[PDB]
Amino acid sequence: VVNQNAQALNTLVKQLSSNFGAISSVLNDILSRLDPPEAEVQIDRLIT
Amino acid sequence: VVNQNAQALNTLVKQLSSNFGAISSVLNDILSRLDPPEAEVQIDRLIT
Amino acid sequence: NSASFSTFKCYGVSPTKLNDLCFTNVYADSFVIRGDEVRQIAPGQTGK
Amino acid sequence: FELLHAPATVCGPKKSTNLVKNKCVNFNFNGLTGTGVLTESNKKFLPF
Amino acid sequence: ILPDPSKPSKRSFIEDLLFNKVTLADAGFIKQYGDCLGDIAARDLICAQ
Protein backbone atom coordinates (compact mmCIF):
# COMPACT_ATOMS: atom_id res chain seq x y z
CA VAL A 1 0.00 0.00 0.00
CA VAL A 2 2.82 2.39 0.87
CA ASN A 3 4.78 1.24 -2.18
CA GLN A 4 1.79 1.70 -4.48
CA ASN A 5 1.30 5.28 -3.31
CA ALA A 6 5.03 6.02 -3.50
CA GLN A 7 5.42 4.68 -7.04
CA ALA A 8 2.19 6.34 -8.17
CA LEU A 9 3.32 9.72 -6.83
CA ASN A 10 6.86 9.10 -8.09
CA THR A 11 5.52 8.43 -11.59
CA LEU A 12 3.38 11.56 -11.38
CA VAL A 13 6.33 13.71 -10.29
CA LYS A 14 8.60 12.33 -13.01
CA GLN A 15 5.97 13.18 -15.64
CA LEU A 16 6.84 16.87 -15.26
CA SER A 17 10.10 16.13 -17.11
CA SER A 18 8.29 15.07 -20.31
CA ASN A 19 7.89 17.67 -23.06
CA PHE A 20 4.94 15.83 -24.68
CA GLY A 21 6.22 17.03 -28.03
CA ALA A 22 6.97 20.55 -26.79
CA ILE A 23 10.37 22.16 -27.23
CA SER A 24 11.06 21.78 -23.50
CA SER A 25 9.42 20.33 -20.40
CA VAL A 26 9.92 23.53 -18.35
CA LEU A 27 7.24 26.19 -18.75
CA ASN A 28 9.72 28.90 -17.72
CA ASP A 29 12.00 28.04 -20.63
CA ILE A 30 9.12 28.25 -23.12
CA LEU A 31 7.97 31.61 -21.76
CA SER A 32 11.56 32.91 -21.69
CA ARG A 33 12.31 32.16 -25.36
CA LEU A 34 8.96 32.26 -27.19
CA ASP A 35 6.60 35.21 -27.41
CA PRO A 36 2.95 34.54 -26.52
CA PRO A 37 1.71 34.09 -30.14
CA GLU A 38 3.43 30.73 -30.70
CA ALA A 39 3.98 30.04 -26.99
CA GLU A 40 0.46 28.66 -26.56
CA VAL A 41 1.09 25.93 -29.15
CA GLN A 42 4.09 24.65 -27.19
CA ILE A 43 2.42 25.29 -23.83
CA ASP A 44 -0.94 23.77 -24.80
CA ARG A 45 0.80 20.44 -25.36
CA LEU A 46 2.20 20.53 -21.82
CA ILE A 47 -1.22 21.00 -20.21
CA THR A 48 -2.74 18.15 -22.22
CA VAL B 1 -16.90 -12.74 -18.60
CA VAL B 2 -15.52 -14.48 -21.68
CA ASN B 3 -17.55 -12.25 -24.00
CA GLN B 4 -16.62 -9.03 -22.18
CA ASN B 5 -12.90 -9.78 -22.47
CA ALA B 6 -13.27 -10.84 -26.10
CA GLN B 7 -15.12 -7.69 -27.17
CA ALA B 8 -12.82 -5.48 -25.09
CA LEU B 9 -9.78 -6.94 -26.85
CA ASN B 10 -11.61 -6.95 -30.18
CA THR B 11 -12.62 -3.32 -29.70
CA LEU B 12 -9.04 -2.45 -28.76
CA VAL B 13 -7.57 -3.91 -31.96
CA LYS B 14 -10.22 -2.50 -34.30
CA GLN B 15 -9.35 1.05 -33.24
CA LEU B 16 -5.99 0.71 -35.01
CA SER B 17 -7.97 1.13 -38.25
CA SER B 18 -9.06 4.65 -37.22
CA ASN B 19 -6.81 7.50 -38.31
CA PHE B 20 -7.88 9.86 -35.48
CA GLY B 21 -7.80 12.67 -38.03
CA ALA B 22 -4.57 11.51 -39.66
CA ILE B 23 -4.35 11.14 -43.43
CA SER B 24 -4.15 7.37 -42.90
CA SER B 25 -4.57 4.86 -40.09
CA VAL B 26 -1.73 2.52 -41.11
CA LEU B 27 1.53 3.75 -39.60
CA ASN B 28 3.90 2.80 -42.42
CA ASP B 29 2.01 4.44 -45.30
CA ILE B 30 2.43 7.90 -43.74
CA LEU B 31 6.20 7.38 -43.83
CA SER B 32 6.15 6.44 -47.53
CA ARG B 33 4.14 9.54 -48.53
CA LEU B 34 5.27 12.29 -46.12
CA ASP B 35 8.76 13.47 -45.21
CA PRO B 36 9.79 13.11 -41.54
CA PRO B 37 9.94 16.82 -40.56
CA GLU B 38 6.27 17.20 -41.56
CA ALA B 39 5.13 13.66 -40.71
CA GLU B 40 5.67 14.20 -36.97
CA VAL B 41 2.36 16.08 -36.74
CA GLN B 42 0.28 13.31 -38.31
CA ILE B 43 2.07 10.44 -36.57
CA ASP B 44 1.51 12.20 -33.24
CA ARG B 45 -2.27 12.07 -33.72
CA LEU B 46 -2.14 8.29 -34.16
CA ILE B 47 -0.06 7.93 -31.00
CA THR B 48 -2.44 10.17 -29.04
CA ASN C 1 16.62 48.37 -36.43
CA SER C 2 18.55 48.17 -39.73
CA ALA C 3 16.83 47.92 -43.10
CA SER C 4 19.80 46.00 -44.53
CA PHE C 5 18.34 42.67 -43.37
CA SER C 6 15.08 42.25 -45.29
CA THR C 7 14.53 38.64 -44.15
CA PHE C 8 15.06 37.98 -40.42
CA LYS C 9 12.71 35.25 -39.14
CA CYS C 10 13.79 33.04 -36.25
CA TYR C 11 12.62 29.45 -35.81
CA GLY C 12 13.27 28.11 -32.32
CA VAL C 13 13.13 31.34 -30.29
CA SER C 14 11.32 34.63 -30.75
CA PRO C 15 13.63 37.36 -32.14
CA THR C 16 12.62 39.78 -29.37
CA LYS C 17 13.81 37.33 -26.70
CA LEU C 18 17.39 37.28 -28.04
CA ASN C 19 18.14 40.28 -25.80
CA ASP C 20 17.30 38.26 -22.65
CA LEU C 21 19.95 35.50 -22.76
CA CYS C 22 23.75 35.57 -22.98
CA PHE C 23 25.09 32.62 -24.95
CA THR C 24 28.93 32.40 -25.02
CA ASN C 25 28.61 29.73 -27.78
CA VAL C 26 26.81 30.44 -31.06
CA TYR C 27 27.59 28.80 -34.40
CA ALA C 28 27.37 31.37 -37.21
CA ASP C 29 27.20 30.07 -40.79
CA SER C 30 27.63 32.47 -43.72
CA PHE C 31 27.11 31.67 -47.40
CA VAL C 32 25.50 33.11 -50.54
CA ILE C 33 22.49 31.57 -52.30
CA ARG C 34 20.06 32.57 -55.02
CA GLY C 35 17.14 34.67 -53.82
CA ASP C 36 14.51 32.19 -54.98
CA GLU C 37 16.13 29.56 -52.74
CA VAL C 38 15.95 31.68 -49.56
CA ARG C 39 12.71 29.93 -48.59
CA GLN C 40 14.47 26.58 -49.07
CA ILE C 41 16.72 27.27 -46.05
CA ALA C 42 14.43 26.06 -43.26
CA PRO C 43 14.22 23.13 -40.82
CA GLY C 44 13.39 19.96 -42.72
CA GLN C 45 12.31 21.47 -46.05
CA THR C 46 13.10 19.58 -49.23
CA GLY C 47 15.09 21.28 -51.97
CA LYS C 48 18.27 21.29 -54.00
CA PHE D 1 22.15 28.06 -30.58
CA GLU D 2 22.86 25.72 -27.67
CA LEU D 3 20.50 24.44 -24.99
CA LEU D 4 22.64 25.47 -21.99
CA HIS D 5 22.76 29.25 -22.63
CA ALA D 6 24.88 29.49 -19.50
CA PRO D 7 28.22 31.22 -19.32
CA ALA D 8 28.26 34.92 -20.34
CA THR D 9 29.09 37.84 -22.62
CA VAL D 10 27.04 37.26 -25.83
CA CYS D 11 23.94 39.45 -25.53
CA GLY D 12 22.76 42.96 -26.27
CA PRO D 13 24.54 46.09 -24.98
CA LYS D 14 22.38 46.76 -21.92
CA LYS D 15 23.14 48.39 -18.57
CA SER D 16 22.79 46.36 -15.39
CA THR D 17 19.65 47.08 -13.37
CA ASN D 18 19.02 47.00 -9.62
CA LEU D 19 18.53 43.98 -7.34
CA VAL D 20 15.60 43.12 -5.08
CA LYS D 21 17.43 42.07 -1.86
CA ASN D 22 15.95 38.58 -1.42
CA LYS D 23 12.48 39.10 -2.89
CA CYS D 24 10.10 36.85 -4.80
CA VAL D 25 11.23 37.60 -8.37
CA ASN D 26 12.08 35.84 -11.63
CA PHE D 27 15.78 35.62 -10.89
CA ASN D 28 17.78 34.98 -14.08
CA PHE D 29 21.09 33.18 -13.53
CA ASN D 30 23.21 32.39 -16.61
CA GLY D 31 20.13 32.83 -18.82
CA LEU D 32 17.66 30.41 -17.25
CA THR D 33 14.88 32.03 -15.24
CA GLY D 34 12.97 30.92 -12.16
CA THR D 35 10.81 32.18 -9.29
CA GLY D 36 12.27 32.36 -5.80
CA VAL D 37 14.15 34.33 -3.18
CA LEU D 38 17.95 34.39 -2.95
CA THR D 39 18.80 31.32 -0.85
CA GLU D 40 22.39 31.24 0.37
CA SER D 41 23.99 27.79 0.38
CA ASN D 42 27.24 26.38 1.78
CA LYS D 43 27.16 22.88 0.28
CA LYS D 44 30.43 21.79 -1.33
CA PHE D 45 29.74 21.31 -5.04
CA LEU D 46 32.21 20.09 -7.65
CA PRO D 47 34.36 22.59 -9.60
CA PHE D 48 32.90 21.49 -12.96
CA ILE E 1 -0.47 -6.99 23.44
CA LEU E 2 -1.70 -4.62 26.16
CA PRO E 3 -0.34 -1.05 26.17
CA ASP E 4 2.97 -0.44 27.93
CA PRO E 5 2.72 2.63 30.22
CA SER E 6 6.51 2.74 30.51
CA LYS E 7 6.90 3.67 26.85
CA PRO E 8 6.21 7.36 26.10
CA SER E 9 3.37 6.34 23.76
CA LYS E 10 0.56 3.93 24.60
CA ARG E 11 1.50 1.52 21.80
CA SER E 12 1.75 -2.07 22.98
CA PHE E 13 4.91 -4.12 22.56
CA ILE E 14 3.71 -5.94 19.44
CA GLU E 15 2.44 -2.71 17.86
CA ASP E 16 6.02 -1.43 18.12
CA LEU E 17 7.17 -4.36 15.99
CA LEU E 18 4.50 -3.67 13.36
CA PHE E 19 5.48 0.00 13.03
CA ASN E 20 9.11 -1.05 12.52
CA LYS E 21 8.18 -3.47 9.72
CA VAL E 22 6.99 -0.63 7.44
CA THR E 23 9.64 1.82 6.25
CA LEU E 24 9.72 4.87 3.98
CA ALA E 25 13.39 4.42 3.02
CA ASP E 26 12.51 3.13 -0.46
CA ALA E 27 10.75 6.36 -1.38
CA GLY E 28 12.11 9.60 -2.80
CA PHE E 29 9.15 11.98 -2.64
CA ILE E 30 7.80 10.87 0.74
CA LYS E 31 11.13 10.44 2.53
CA GLN E 32 12.34 13.94 1.65
CA TYR E 33 8.87 15.31 2.43
CA GLY E 34 9.25 14.58 6.14
CA ASP E 35 12.72 16.09 6.48
CA CYS E 36 11.34 19.56 5.69
CA LEU E 37 9.59 19.91 9.05
CA GLY E 38 12.93 19.14 10.71
CA ASP E 39 14.82 21.79 8.71
CA ILE E 40 15.42 25.18 10.34
CA ALA E 41 18.67 26.21 8.66
CA ALA E 42 16.99 26.74 5.29
CA ARG E 43 15.41 30.17 4.83
CA ASP E 44 11.72 30.29 3.86
CA LEU E 45 11.62 26.50 3.43
CA ILE E 46 7.94 26.12 2.51
CA CYS E 47 7.83 22.48 1.39
CA ALA E 48 4.07 22.56 0.84
CA GLN E 49 5.14 24.45 -2.31
UniProtKB/Swiss-Prot annotation, chain E:
Disulfide bonds join C36-C47. Residues 24-49 are annotated as: Disordered. The record marks R11, S12 as: Cleavage. Residues 12-33 are annotated as: Fusion peptide 1. Residues 31-49 are annotated as: Fusion peptide 2. Precursor of the fusion protein processed in the biosynthesis of the S protein and the formation of virus particle. Mediates fusion of the virion and cellular membranes by functioning as a class I viral fusion protein. Contains two viral fusion peptides that are unmasked after cleavage. The S2/S2' cleavage occurs during virus entry at the cell membrane by host TMPRSS2 or during endocytosis by host CSTL. This is Spike protein S2. The chain holds residues 805 to 853 of 1273 of the full protein.
